[PDB]
Write a protein that binds this ligand. Structure first.
Ligand code: NA
Length: 207
């Protein structure tokens, strides 16, 4: 269970957000571009770093240590994994996964579960570092060197294919992080598409 790593290095995980604040805000902003109205759930809500600023009230998380931090920050968190969502069929308008699908045990199953819990017309928003980006190449090359040794890296197109095979359609993509996170002194802009920025956000529709 790759997710165990986040229990084990929770303080290191949180540090990232303080050390790389502008990259974090860039990512939030990219997610915020494709976030719809209605009732959302964050799958793999971690310590609430996305749910809290995005005003997502419900989250699912397997790590008790992480869940407790999210709970203190105001998120209502159900214990569970992406592959077995403790949620009813067609009960959400959207679902969000930010740097979660890379650490699930079964990405295909996790996308099927997301499909299940969404209402007709609902949306799945997935954020990833694109394997095929300057930054993706670096993380992958240096994976054997905490979070990524057992991570699975996705290209944007690989992730879309999987989402399409889980039942999603009418994809919309945005991108950000054109500079390295260690050299940001301001928020990075968001643009449509993919191929240029390291962080990509993809929305699919359950029609
Ligand atoms: Na996550």
């Amino acid at each position: 269970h790759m997710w165990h790593i986040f229990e084990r290095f929770v303080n290191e995980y949180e540090r990232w957000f303080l050390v790389h604040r502008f990259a974090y805000l860039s990512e939030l902003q990219a997610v915020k571009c494709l976030l719809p109205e209605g009732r959302g759930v964050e799958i793999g809500v971690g310590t609430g770093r996305f749910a809290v600023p995005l005003k997502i009230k419900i989250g699912v998380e397997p790590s008790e240590r992480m869940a407790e931090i999210a709970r203190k920050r105001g998120v209502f968190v159900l214990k569970g994994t992406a592959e077995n969502l403790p949620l009813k069929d067609e009960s959400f308008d959207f679902a969000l996964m930010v740097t979660t699908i890379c650490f699930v045990d079964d990405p295909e199953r996790a996308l099927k579960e997301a499909y299940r819990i969404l209402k007709k017309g609902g949306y799945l928003i997935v954020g990833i570092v694109d394997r095929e980006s300057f930054l993706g190449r670096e993380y992958e090359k240096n994976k054997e060197k905490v979070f990524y040794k057992n991570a699975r890296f996705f290209s944007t197109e690989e992730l879309m294919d999987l989402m399409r095979k889980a039942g999603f359609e009418e994809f919309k993509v945005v991108q950000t992080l054109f500079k390295h996170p260690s050299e940001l002194s301001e928020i990075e802009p968001v643009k449509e598409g993919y191929g240029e920025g390291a962080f990509v956000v993809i929305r699919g529709t359950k029609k």
